[PDB]
RNA sequence: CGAGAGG
DNA sequence: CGATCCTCTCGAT
């Protein structure tokens, strides 16, 4: 509504594996040393390159119909660089109490494993991923 | 057999046969001619009457029109001639032969009918120029192609004579064949080919495409999805206009080689409420496949349903590859130079291994592997040698092969194409074979005049070492030419052959038939199977399922 | 002058033949990668050699552009289909009063074309046009 | 002036070659379509024939006399015959012409649209004159006769468009080209080794300035600035194949807004 | 022999009428228009027109059959705003944007030289 | 026409095939398709 | 068809607007499918077409005779000094938008042959008509306005569905169908039925 | 493992954990007796035969015999609850299912398999490549194969071309 | 450019198709199958040209 | 006679798709030969499209015969008929 | 067989250019290539029209009838 | 051989083995040899597990044989159907051919079998013995055109 | 009746 | 005693 989760992470690793719009991007957080990140991202639109501080935000915020951005009187929850729509659709216990899991960007994948997801990421049509500078 | 198992028919027509991407699955373009040669007999209701006077009114050359007005007491009003076609006044109980309109059921056949599918109702669409149209996903059951074919229609004129058309031959009843117990039509070609393309992780279509892609699925909600980028520029991914033709309920699960729910490569395949998660749609998932889209589609949602998908899923790819364009050229043989160093160099190392064992073998050094003559283990290897060396040299050629490469494209949809091809046009077209041998010794100890006798060598017997790119010599020209004539020969064999046997079997078992005690018995009523196919079950219906109590350690199993 | 011989089936069984009189015998002692792979000599003693390699094909398959550069039934397959395409099968046409005659409108002759073609009148009374041919998907028609 | 611009880059009797700038792609392509196919133009359409001792068939000859290029500059002043009163045709929606030819010489006698001559009232319109462009000045070679060959026969011109036959047409190809540098990425060059060494570059990218590999991909960038060039057959001047286009475009773009005024009513 | 004439290109029928107006069911503000008797040269532009209207909020065409001269245009704009206005403002604009690259060429020609 | 004019019918080991002996004498690819496949042949 | 086994029969026909275009505003004559060209290992036609661009720029002779010293590769070249990409492709444009189109089309001038069999000598459609003299059953052939046959395959098929109905009027209705009049004693068609 | 039978139940528990939305989370309102005994109840509802005989009541049961295998190693106490998290409601949908499912998957009678059965293989015959085969690389390993080997069965061909005893 | 090598027989030209047969006056010896008594056999077709 | 009683019937209490067929057919040739319909035709003019309804409604007066091998046989009403497929 | 009148492909008008082209050939002993460039003809759907034809017209003309 | 076989630890395991392939067949001969085991021995020759271990083994082979036929191709034909032939052929005690020589000189209907082969002579020998026609069959009513009792026509309509 | 031919 | 189906056209007695 609202903001799931919030991370500042680095890129640790890139990956144009047999594409030239899409990027397999390797993170982790830079506060959680357990936190781990995997993206696909369009590097036409958002050029990612290593050692990248990127900060990752998830939100099911700002059913119906996609209206054009008509920005003439729209303020949309972002400030943000790059964003993306997607569905959850694996949730994954990575032994101990670690959880991880699985979003889909039109076919563009996440996975993001930590543990303090508990009152946050349902299984959900929702979530937008934001990521900034 | 001519006058009573077969024989000429009224109410037929043929033509040449032509593709239509604008057509649904149970459709059948109608010439315009032809559907004013064909009639219906109507009987006047008070539900037709106005139709049918209006039809009698256009008469036999205006299309919604009729010839032949039959009354009470059997008497024909042919309507082209009759001094009274113009003023003419319906009765009830009257029959009207009206010409073969819009979605009439008709039975639509290609030659040699050998398949219940090679025979299926269609509804009629009347339509301008001289040949039947059909739709692309209807090819392979009547194994139809547009190289001239010529296709057959029969027009029921019993009411209840259409109703077994409709209700038993209709082209979507007819999705899932019971013979191999999955489909058998998928897509195909283009849209095979375009669907691949299309559904790239790199592929991002914008908004201007992505509307008018929208508006071309016919079953669309009017509700425009959420683009997967938001962000600069909203774009939408080929997967996400795609999952607009999928139906909601439609679950799909793969694992190919490398896939993992992460998918890194993009392969197998996850649909969630007819949604693409991810995996490359291709010819195993859009396939006339054992676990497919279709197979799903049909069991799940309807015939009706899955033949509509065809329709969308067609209308949607064909439109972005119009948009988008495919091609193939020359260059698309052409393999680097470096792999084409690597490629003669393997060839190389082929000839010395030959060569070698030639060698030894004419030292009398060659031992001979038990139930087979010292020459039979010697031809054995060379053989051997040389069908290595193509298939190495192939695979070079394979691996060089850019992603951006046609060919290459075509061999990933599952539209067009084998290794094989890719390995003879580009790096070496092989070993050439008659009677299973390498060319043999036609004149006195050799194959050609222009070698010696008693010649082994690759070159003499027909290894073939230029690629199709490359040109064949004259010796490696007329040495495909022996090999190539074996094929045409045994073709033809083939034909006659499966031709004979198909209606032996069918006459053998022709009067076979499940009684209403599910015991499959013959004319006599003498038992072939208590319950049909041991189980009593209809082939259409199954499926491959695997029984989890079988396998695993006995471990796993109590776990 | 018994430079050129007549040789049957059964005395081609006795005698020697090279390929080309150039490449087939001239010496011996760099290579374009394009050209194809052409075995050596390996054999000297010849008798006699081929007017042209060519020339082991037959009228039809003579009209074939690069017929060494497709698998051999395509070639079998236009050896048949030759024979039902049209163009001016006569300049005396007009003069003929056969049953079914076809003729071509504006005739053309190939832009690529074999030396056999020649003597076969074909560029002299040619059947097809040189259409510009696009390979694509298009409308899906 | 304030919406699409223009800059003739070379202007010929029958050559255009422009710049198009500040317009959608849709506009252009329209335009080009539109000069294809929807402009009207005067050709033969009915030929009666009379005698023809030739070589060649009745309908043959007929075809070629449809091909044949007629002076359309007065075009718009002449009706279609499907919309004139009277039965058949007329002075006010049709141009006709006469052909006789006989083989006088010993040697081969040849027929030119020169030949051709108006009989119709032209009622001082610049129409249905057969163009000519040939230096010799004879223009097209109809037919070939020999010595007691006769070819008598005469012929209705009408006005017409590409769209019902190509005979209408009143250009020959019109080149099209936007974004020489691919800027855009409207376009994936297939390549072996390098796209840039194995694709000839464009006369047009010396009129647009180079990508700069030190610089992202333009994502808000739109199709727009058209490098164009329309050539004319000759049976109007080539400034008119891209006036009446623009013309003919929003002539139809008015009915449309027309029929919507119609059926607002009953 | 079953190939239609050409003038049913662009020559209306009997009966035929240039635009139908249909109400669009799955959607509200929608509207389908079918234009008898045009092609990918009204088609597209009229299209491409409505998209550089921020009031139309979808706007598509397609040609269901390459046969038949006819496409089907779906327009759906904001609350308070009728498609016919739409569609009217978007014919006005292409006029005026044709009108001046009329004047603007013309100016041109005269300024040139062979 | 010329075609016509070198055909060569062959009545009834291996008759069809494409036998070594046929180099430079008859031609490798004019043959029919089925029926009559490798026993007409073409000089 | 080309002459290289490449058979296949007209779908459509575009006019010069809808088709694709090369930007010098060249439009083909003729659009065959990527597709009909793996499975038949058909390089002769893309080379005798790449050699075909060639002669027409040049204005020289195709040399496609066999063997040869000819080479793709060669010819490439000679095409690349013309002002064309090599391998014989051209960017080209969508007719309807004039978008140019994302892949690059292998476009050039390629020998194609009009052969006989055509439609309109081939479309036949039979709604009751003439009937042989010794069998009762519609006549043979276009030529005669024939029925289609409706064989013992057909027959099959139509068993395989359980249409039954269908069968029986096909093999009836639409054909052979008679009446005769049998003795209930001898069971023969051997009964003088004055009728009226 | 895999086998062709009637009803996927895959794809009905999929559809049934959709349908009902179950979350992973929260404990099945199922009982033993319940998995148990309604699975147990289900086996008794896949008529395939309907005879109140011993003699067709143990055709039945032997029909059934395979499928029972997969409905018994897919609905087991364990999966039913671990596996998938099916409640009471959407477990008792995916017996009504199956049920549905199994009764629509039996033979129509009145199809006619005879001449079914025979154009299944004829068809795939006519389909079928060489008249030699594919295995032509070894000089003597060469066995009959395709259409004339397929000639050789159906002819009863007394004397066949590579007779072979495999000696295990 | 028509070559000849044709009849006219009542208006209608006829082609005569060259007829492959096997040499006769040679000697050719055949190998019989095994279920025969005879194991090979010394062929000739003797004919007066 | 011969025949089977009600109770003591073996076969599938389900019509068969070429039940369904000739019932479908039968009907919509009666309807079509101005028949008196069964059910109130919400706007239906095609024979099959109203037997189709008919069917539906179960308002079809039509009893299957359905033979045994041994020449015995089974009466079962189109009423009495589940219509799954 | 007359040099048709306008390209197959473009529609320019080659009918015209014919006598020309074979002039430029004899006359001023020059080469296709440059000789059809010469006439203009650029495109090469264009250059194949005239490179092409077969002008069997003057072959009929030598029949009497 | 690569055969797979259960573990001790219940997992199904690639255990390889040695097979003796044979040119030609005696199998009443072979399988009573020493060292062999006579409950594994198969032949490509089905005639001979027929006359060796009975028809029913018989019906075993003659399939498996069939089936190879189809999957050898690489294609897949559903059980039932090879099922239902292989039946069809085995069902009369013995290996009846589908041939001119097994099913059709068969106890059936003397019209539908001269609509197969051997036309004439079948309805010659009808007539000599007096053969009575069931008119059951398809092709008797194919041939009466009458409604066959094929799918549709299985059944009887009533009111 | 036979020959040619199409898929 | 059979030996793919089907289709088309021509020609000759
Ligand atoms: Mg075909
Ligand atoms: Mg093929
Ligand atoms: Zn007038
Ligand atoms: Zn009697
Ligand atoms: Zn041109």
């Known amino acids: 509504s609202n903001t799931l989760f919030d991370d500042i992470f680095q890129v640790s690793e890139v990956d144009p594996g047999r594409y030239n719009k899409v990027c397999r991007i390797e993170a982790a957080s830079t506060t959680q040393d357990q936190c781990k990140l995997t993206l696909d991202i369009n590097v036409e639109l958002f050029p990612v390159a290593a050692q990248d501080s990127l900060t990752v935000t998830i939100a099911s915020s700002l059913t119906r119909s996609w209206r054009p951005p008509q920005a003439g009187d729209r303020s949309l929850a972002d400030d943000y660089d790059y964003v993306m729509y997607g569905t959850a659709y694996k949730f994954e216990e990575v032994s101990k109490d670690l959880i991880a899991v699985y979003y889909s960007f039109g076919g563009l994948l996440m996975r993001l494993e930590g543990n303090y997801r508990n009152l946050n990421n349902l299984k959900q049509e929702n979530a937008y991923l934001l990521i900034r500078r | 057999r001519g006058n009573l198992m077969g024989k000429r028919v009224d109410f037929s027509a043929r033509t040449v046969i032509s593709g239509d991407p604008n057509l649904e699955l149970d459709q059948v373009g109608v010439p315009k001619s032809i559907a004013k040669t064909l009639t219906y007999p109507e009987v006047v209701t008070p539900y037709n009457i106005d139709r049918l006077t209006q039809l009698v009114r256009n008469g036999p050359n205006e299309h919604p029109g009729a010839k032949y007005v039959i009354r009470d007491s059997g008497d024909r009003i042919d309507l082209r001639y009759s001094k009274r076609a113009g003023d003419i006044q319906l009765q009830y109980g009257w029959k009207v032969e009206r010409h073969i309109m819009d979605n009439d059921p008709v039975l639509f056949n290609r030659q040699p009918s050998l398949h219940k599918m090679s025979m299926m109702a269609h509804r009629v669409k009347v339509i301008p120029y001289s040949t039947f149209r059909l739709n692309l996903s209807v090819t392979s059951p009547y194994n139809a192609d547009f190289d001239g074919d010529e296709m057959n229609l029969h027009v029921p004129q019993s009411e209840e004579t259409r109703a077994e058309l409709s209700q038993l031959c209709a082209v979507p009843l007819q999705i899932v064949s019971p013979q191999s117990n999955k489909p058998c039509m998928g897509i195909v070609q283009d849209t095979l080919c375009g669907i691949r393309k299309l559904t790239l992780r790199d592929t991002f279509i914008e908004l201007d495409q992505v509307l008018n892609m929208l508006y071309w699925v016919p079953d669309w909600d009017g509700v425009i999805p959420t683009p997967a980028i938001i962000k600069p520029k909203p774009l939408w991914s080929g997967k996400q206009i795609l999952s607009v033709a999928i139906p909601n309920g439609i679950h799909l699960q793969r694992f190919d080689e490398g896939t993992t729910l992460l998918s890194p490569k993009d392969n197998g395949m996850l649909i969630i409420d007819g949604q693409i998660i991810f995996g490359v749609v291709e010819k195993k998932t859009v396939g006339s496949s054992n676990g497919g889209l279709i197979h799903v589609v049909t069991r799940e949602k309807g015939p009706q349903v899955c033949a509509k998908l065809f329709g969308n899923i067609q209308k949607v790819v064909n439109f972005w590859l119009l948009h988008n364009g495919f091609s193939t050229g020359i260059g698309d043989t052409i393999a680097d130079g470096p792999t084409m160093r690597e490629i003669t160099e393997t060839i190389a190392e082929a000839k010395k291994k030959v060569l070698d064992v030639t060698k030894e073998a004419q030292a009398n050094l060659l031992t001979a592997k038990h139930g087979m003559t010292l020459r039979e283990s010697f031809e054995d290897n060379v053989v051997r040698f040389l069908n290595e060396a193509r298939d190495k040299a192939g695979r070079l050629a394979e691996v060089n092969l850019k992603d951006l490469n046609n060919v290459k494209q075509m061999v990933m949809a599952g539209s067009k194409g084998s290794f094989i091809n890719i390995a003879q046009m580009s790096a070496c077209v092989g070993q050439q074979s008659v009677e299973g041998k390498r060319i043999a010794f036609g004149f006195v100890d050799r194959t050609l005049p222009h070698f010696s006798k008693d010649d082994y060598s690759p070159e003499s017997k027909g290894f073939v070492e230029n690629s199709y790119l490359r040109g064949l010599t004259p010796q490696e020209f007329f040495f495909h030419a022996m090999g190539g004539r074996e094929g045409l020969i045994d073709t033809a064999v083939k034909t006659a052959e499966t031709g004979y046997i198909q209606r032996r079997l069918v006459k053998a078992l022709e009067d076979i038939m499940v009684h209403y005690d599910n015991t499959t018995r013959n004319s006599l009523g003498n038992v072939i199977q208590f319950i049909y196919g041991e189980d009593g079950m209809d082939a259409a219906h199954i499926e491959k399922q695997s029984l989890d109590t079988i396998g695993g350690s006995d471990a796993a199993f109590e776990k | 002058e018994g430079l050129v011989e007549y040789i049957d089936a059964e005395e081609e069984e006795s005698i020697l033949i090279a390929m080309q009189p150039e490449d087939l015998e001239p010496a011996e002692a760099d290579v374009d990668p394009a050209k194809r792979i052409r075995v050596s000599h390996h054999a000297t003693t010849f008798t006699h050699c081929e007017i042209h390699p060519s020339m082991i094909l037959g009228v039809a398959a003579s009209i074939i552009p690069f017929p060494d550069h497709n698998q051999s039934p395509r070639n079998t397959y236009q050896s048949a289909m030759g024979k039902q395409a049209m163009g001016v099968f006569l300049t005396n046409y007009n003069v003929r009063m056969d049953t079914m005659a076809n003729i071509l409108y504006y005739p053309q002759k190939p832009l690529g074309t074999t030396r056999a073609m020649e003597y076969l009148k074909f560029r002299e009374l040619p059947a097809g046009q040189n259409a510009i041919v696009a390979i694509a998907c298009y409308s899906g028609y | 002036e304030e919406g699409p611009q223009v800059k003739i880059r070379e202007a010929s009797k029958d050559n255009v070659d422009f710049i198009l700038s500040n317009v959608d792609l849709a506009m252009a392509n329209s335009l080009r379509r539109v000069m294809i196919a929807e402009i009207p133009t005067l050709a033969i359409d009915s030929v009666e024939v009379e005698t023809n001792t030739t070589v060649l068939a009745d309908e043959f000859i007929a075809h070629r006399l449809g091909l044949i290029p007629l002076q359309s500059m007065d075009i718009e002043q002449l009706e279609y015959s499907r919309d004139c009163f009277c039965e058949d045709h007329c002075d006010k929606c049709s141009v006709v012409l006469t052909l006789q030819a006989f083989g006088e010489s010993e040697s081969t006698t040849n027929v030119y649209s020169k030949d051709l001559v108006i009989v119709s009232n032209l009622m001082g319109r610049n129409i249905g004159h057969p163009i000519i462009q040939d230096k010799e000045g004879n223009g097209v070679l109809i037919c070939k006769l020999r010595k007691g060959q006769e070819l008598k026969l005469t012929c209705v011109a009408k006005k017409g468009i590409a769209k019902e036959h190509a005979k209408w047409g009143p250009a020959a190809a019109i080149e099209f080209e936007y974004d020489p540098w691919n800027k855009l990425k409207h376009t994936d060059y297939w390549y072996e080794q390098d796209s840039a060494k194995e694709w000839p570059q464009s006369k047009n990218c010396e009129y647009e300035d180079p990508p700069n590999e030190g610089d992202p991909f333009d994502y808000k960038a739109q199709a727009d600035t058209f490098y164009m060039n329309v050539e004319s057959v000759g049976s109007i001047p080539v400034d008119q194949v891209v006036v009446r286009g623009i013309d003919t475009l929003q002539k139809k773009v008015a009915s449309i807004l027309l029929a919507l005024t119609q059926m607002d009513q009953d | 022999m079953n190939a239609p004439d050409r003038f049913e290109l662009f020559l209306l029928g009997e009966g035929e009428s240039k635009l139908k107006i249909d109400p669009d069911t799955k959607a509200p503000n929608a509207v389908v228009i079918t234009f008898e008797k045009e092609d990918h040269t009204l088609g597209n532009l009229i299209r491409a027109e409505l998209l550089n209207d921020r009031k139309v909020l979808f706007a598509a065409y397609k040609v269901e059959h390459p046969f038949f001269a006819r496409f089907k245009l779906r327009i759906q704009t904001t609350e308070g705003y009728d498609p016919k206005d739409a569609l009217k403002n978007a014919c006005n604009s292409i006029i005026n944007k044709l009108g001046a690259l009329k004047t603007n060429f013309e100016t041109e020609w005269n300024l040139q030289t062979l | 026409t010329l075609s016509h004019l070198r055909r060569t019918n062959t009545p009834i080991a291996k008759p069809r095939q494409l036998h070594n002996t046929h180099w430079g004498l008859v031609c490798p690819a004019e043959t029919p398709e089925g029926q009559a496949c490798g026993l007409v042949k073409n000089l | 068809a080309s002459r290289h086994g490449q058979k296949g029969t007209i779908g459509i026909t575009y006019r010069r607007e809808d088709m694709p275009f090369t930007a010098e505003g060249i439009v083909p004559d003729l659009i065959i499918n990527p597709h009909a060209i793996?499975?038949?290992?058909?390089?002769?036609?893309?080379?005798?077409?790449?050699?075909?661009?060639?002669?027409?720029?040049?204005?020289?002779?195709?040399?496609?005779?066999?063997?040869?010293?000819?080479?793709?590769?060669?010819?490439?070249?000679?095409?690349?000094?013309?002002?064309?990409?090599?391998?014989?492709?051209?960017?080209?444009?969508?007719?309807?938008?004039?978008?140019?189109?994302?892949?690059?089309?292998?476009?050039?001038?390629?020998?194609?042959?009009?052969?006989?069999?055509?439609?309109?000598?081939?479309?036949?459609?039979?709604?009751?008509?003439?009937?042989?003299?010794?069998?009762?059953?519609?006549?043979?052939?276009?030529?005669?306005?024939?029925?289609?046959?409706?064989?013992?395959?057909?027959?099959?098929?139509?068993?395989?569905?359980?249409?039954?109905?269908?069968?029986?009027?096909?093999?009836?209705?639409?054909?052979?169908?008679?009446?005769?009049?049998?003795?209930?004693?001898?069971?023969?068609?051997?009964?003088?039925?004055?009728?009226? | 493992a895999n086998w062709p039978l009637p009803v996927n139940i895959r794809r009905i528990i999929q559809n049934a954990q959709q349908t009902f939305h179950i979350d992973h989370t929260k404990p099945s309102d199922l009982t033993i007796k319940d998995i148990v005994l309604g699975v147990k109840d289900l086996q008794e509802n896949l008529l395939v035969l309907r005879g109140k005989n011993e003699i067709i009541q143990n055709a039945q049961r032997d029909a059934v015999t395979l499928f029972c295998c997969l409905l018994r190693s897919r609905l087991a106490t364990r999966r039913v609850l671990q596996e998938y998290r099916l409640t009471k409601q959407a477990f008792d949908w995916v017996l009504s299912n199956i049920e549905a499912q199994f009764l629509r998957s039996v033979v129509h009678?009145?199809?006619?398999?005879?001449?079914?059965?025979?154009?299944?293989?004829?068809?795939?015959?006519?389909?079928?490549?060489?008249?030699?085969?594919?295995?032509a690389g070894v000089a003597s390993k060469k066995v009959t194969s395709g259409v004339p080997r397929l000639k050789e069965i159906l002819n009863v061909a007394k004397n066949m071309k590579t007779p072979s005893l495999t000696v295990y | 450019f028509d070559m000849g090598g044709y009849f006219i027989i009542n208006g209608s030209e006829k082609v005569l198709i060259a007829q492959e047969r096997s040499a006769g006056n040679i000697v050719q010896v055949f190998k019989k199958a095994a279920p025969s008594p005879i194991s090979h056999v010394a062929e000739i077709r003797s004919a007066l040209e | 006679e011969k025949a089977i009683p009600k109770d003591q019937r073996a076969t599938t209490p389900y019509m068969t798709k070429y039940e369904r067929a000739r019932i479908l057919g039968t009907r919509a040739l009666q309807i079509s030969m101005n028949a008196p319909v069964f059910v109130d035709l919400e706007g239906e003019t095609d024979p099959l499209r109203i037997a189709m309804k008919e069917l539906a409604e179960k308002k079809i007066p039509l009893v299957i015969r359905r033979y045994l091998p041994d020449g015995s046989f089974e009466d079962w009403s189109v009423e009495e008929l589940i219509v799954d497929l | 067989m007359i040099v048709p009148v306008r390209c197959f492909s473009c529609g320019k008008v080659v009918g015209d250019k014919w006598e020309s082209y074979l002039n430029l050939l004899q006359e001023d002993e020059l080469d296709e290539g440059t000789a059809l460039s010469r006439l203009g003809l650029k495109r090469y759907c264009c250059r194949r029209m005239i490179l092409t034809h077969v002008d069997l017209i003057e072959k009929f003309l030598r029949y009497n009838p | 051989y690569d055969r797979k076989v259960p573990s001790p630890t219940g997992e199904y395991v690639k255990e390889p083995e040695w097979v003796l392939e044979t040119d030609g067949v005696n199998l009443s001969e072979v399988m009573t040899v020493p060292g062999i085991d006579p409950t594994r021995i198969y032949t490509n020759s089905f005639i001979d597990i027929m006359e060796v271990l009975g028809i029913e083994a018989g019906r075993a082979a003659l399939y498996k044989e069939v089936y190879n036929v189809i999957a050898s191709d690489g294609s897949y034909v559903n059980y039932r159907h090879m099922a239902l032939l292989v039946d069809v052929m085995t069902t009369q005690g013995g290996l009846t051919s589908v041939t001119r020589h097994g099913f059709n000189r068969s106890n059936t209907g003397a019209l539908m079998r001269c609509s197969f082969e051997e036309t004439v002579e079948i309805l010659f020998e009808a007539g000599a013995s007096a053969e009575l026609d069931d008119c059951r069959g398809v092709s008797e009513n194919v041939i009466l055109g009458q409604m066959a009792p094929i799918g549709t026509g299985a059944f009887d309509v009533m009111i």
Request: hydrophobic content about 40%; aromatic content about 6%; overall charge positive.
């Open chain 8, 109 to 135: 009678p009145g199809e006619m398999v005879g001449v079914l059965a025979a154009q299944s293989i004829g068809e795939p015959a006519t389909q079928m490549t060489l008249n030699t085969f594919h295995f």
């Open chain 7, 38 to 196: 793996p499975s038949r290992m058909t390089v002769a036609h893309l080379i005798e077409c790449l050699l075909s661009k060639v002669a027409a720029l040049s204005g020289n002779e195709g040399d496609a005779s066999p063997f040869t010293d000819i080479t793709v590769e060669g010819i490439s070249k000679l095409l690349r000094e013309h002002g064309y990409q090599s391998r014989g492709f051209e960017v080209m444009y969508n007719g309807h938008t004039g978008k140019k189109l994302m892949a690059q089309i292998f476009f050039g001038p390629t020998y194609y042959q009009r052969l006989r069999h055509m439609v309109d000598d081939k479309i036949h459609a039979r709604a009751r008509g003439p009937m042989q003299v010794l069998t009762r059953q519609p006549v043979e052939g276009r030529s005669r306005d024939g029925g289609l046959r409706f064989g013992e395959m057909e027959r099959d098929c139509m068993i395989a569905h359980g249409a039954a109905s269908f069968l029986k009027e096909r093999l009836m209705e639409a054909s052979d169908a008679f009446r005769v009049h049998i003795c209930g004693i001898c069971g023969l068609m051997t009964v003088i039925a004055k009728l009226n």
